[PDB]
Design a protein around this ligand. Structure first.
Ligand code: AWJ
Length: 295
C-alpha cells in the first residue's frame, strides 16, 4: 500500500521504525474510541503514542499504516511531527510530537477567564491560535491536501502558557477517504456542497476553518448551540449562519461570515484568511476587547 503526497510516493518502508526496546509508555491520555493514546518516551524524547489494538480487522491495520504515512510526509511547523513508528512489534505504535498543552477544545474550556483567573486568556492569544492553524491549512491547500475535518478537537497546543503554538494534530477523516456513516460525519463543520454533493475542495476546509474560528472565540462551545446535525444541515442550506460569539469583535466575525459564503468560489483561500487575521492582530479595537468572564 503506497501513499502519494506532493511530488513523491512513499511506502511503509519509508517510515522510520523505532526499536521497541527504546519506547516506554508513561500514562494514558484519554485514549479515543479506536486505539489508545499514551504519553511516552523514546530513549530522552517525549512522545505521544498511538496504538493499534491487536484485535482489529485487516482494514484497521491498513488505515493505521495510512495514517502513519500521511503524517510522516508533512513538513510544517503547524502540523504535528511524526517521530517514527513501531510496526514490527505488537501492538503497533505511531509516535508523535507530544503537545503538552493538550487539545484546543479542552484548553479553551479549561482556560476560560474566571474571577479567580480573569487574565487567563486575551483576544490576542485567540488570534494567534487562529493564525497558527490557518498557517497549517495554507500549507495543506498549497500542497493540494484536503483535511476534511478542521475543528478544535483536532488541534493541539505545544504548551498551556504564553509561548503556545497550535498545530493540526489529527488526520483521521482524510485517511478514511484516501482508503463510516451519516451519524459520524462532522456535519456542523461542513459546507453545503460537501454534505449534499460529497464534493470536497480546499474551499471545504475554508468553511470548516470559519467554524473553528467560532469555536475559538466562543471559547470552546459546541457549534450551533441547541441544534442537532439535521437541524444544522437544514439551517445552513437555507442560508442560516451562527451569530457572533459573545464579545466577538466585528472584524473577526466578518472572517467567519466570509468563510461561510454559500458558494465555494466566494470563500477566501487561506492566504487571504491569514492576511485578514493579521490585520485583526494589528487593530487595537480588536485586541483591546475583553473576553467574557464566566461566573
Ligand atoms: C497531552 C494531551 N492531553 C490531551 C487531552 C487529554 O485531550 C487534554 O487536552 S490530548 C494530548 C496530546 C498531546 N500530543 C499529541 N500528539 C496527542 O495526539 C493524539 C493522537 C491526539 C491528537 C489530536 F489532534 C486530537 C486528539 C488526540 N487525542 N487526545 C487523546 C487521545 N487522542 C495528544
Amino acid at each position: 500500500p503506497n501513499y502519494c503526497f506532493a511530488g513523491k510516493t512513499s511506502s511503509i518502508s519509508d517510515l522510520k521504525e523505532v526499536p521497541r526496546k527504546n519506547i516506554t509508555l508513561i500514562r494514558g491520555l484519554g485514549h479515543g474510541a479506536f486505539g489508545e493514546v499514551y504519553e511516552g518516551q523514546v530513549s530522552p524524547l517525549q512522545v505521544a503514542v498511538k496504538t493499534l489494538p491487536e484485535v482489529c480487522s485487516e482494514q484497521d491495520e491498513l488505515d493505521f499504516l495510512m495514517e502513519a504515512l500521511i503524517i510522516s510526509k508533512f513538513n510544517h511547523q503547524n502540523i504535528v511531527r511524526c517521530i517514527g513508528v513501531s510496526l514490527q512489534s505488537l501492538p503497533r505504535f505511531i509516535l508523535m510530537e507530544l503537545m503538552a498543552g493538550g487539545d484546543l477544545k479542552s484548553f479553551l474550556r479549561e482556560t476560560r477567564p474566571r474571577p479567580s483567573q480573569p487574565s487567563s486568556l486575551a483576544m490576542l492569544d485567540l488570534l494567534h491560535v487562529a493564525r497558527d492553524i490557518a498557517c497549517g491549512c495554507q500549507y495543506l491547500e498549497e500542497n493540494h491536501f484536503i483535511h476534511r475535518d478542521i475543528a478544535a478537537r483536532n488541534c493541539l497546543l505545544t504548551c498551556p502558557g504564553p509561548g503556545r503554538v497550535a498545530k493540526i494534530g489529527d488526520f483521521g477523516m482524510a485517511r478514511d477517504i484516501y482508503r463510516g456513516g451519516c451519524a459520524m460525519l462532522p456535519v456542523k463543520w461542513m459546507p453545503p456542497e460537501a454534505f449534499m454533493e460529497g464534493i470536497f475542495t480546499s474551499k471545504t476546509d475554508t468553511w470548516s476553518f470559519g467554524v473553528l474560528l467560532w469555536e475559538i472565540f466562543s471559547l470552546g462551545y459546541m457549534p450551533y448551540p441547541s441544534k442537532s446535525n439535521q437541524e444544522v444541515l437544514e439551517f445552513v442550506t437555507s442560508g442560516g449562519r451562527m451569530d457572533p460569539p459573545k464579545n466577538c469583535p466585528g472584524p473577526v466575525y466578518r472572517i467567519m461570515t466570509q468563510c461561510w459564503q454559500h458558494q465555494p468560489e466566494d470563500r477566501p483561500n487561506f492566504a487571504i484568511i491569514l492576511e485578514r487575521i493579521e490585520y485583526c492582530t494589528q487593530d487595537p479595537d480588536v485586541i483591546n476587547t475583553a473576553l467574557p468572564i464566566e461566573y
